[PDB]
């Protein structure tokens, strides 16, 4: 399965098994025996607009 979304820059540390915070609490929660991989890259020029 591939899940996709957009978050802040310093919220990428809550996408991991066993974390807390406004993102992992109630936006997107990863089980505690996760198996896959997590990939993330900056996208300032595409998603941020004056």
């Amino acid at each position: 399965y591939a899940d996709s979304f957009v978050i802040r820059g310093d919220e990428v540390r809550q996408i991991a098994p066993g974390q807390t915070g406004k993102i992992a609490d109630y936006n997107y929660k990863l089980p505690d025996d996760f198996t896959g991989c997590v990939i993330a890259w900056n996208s300032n020029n595409l998603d941020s607009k004056v």
Binding site: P17, G18, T20, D32
Partner: protein, 45 residues
Amino acid sequence: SALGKLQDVVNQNAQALNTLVKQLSSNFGAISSVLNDILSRLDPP
């Protein structure tokens, strides 16, 4: 009005059963030895 051979069996068994119960208040290198306080002061991982 002697029976020490019968008292020894009772004594050794009661004393070996007392040690098993006393071994429940030891952390064995955890924070505490009571399964709730470990459980209501940390999160699952």
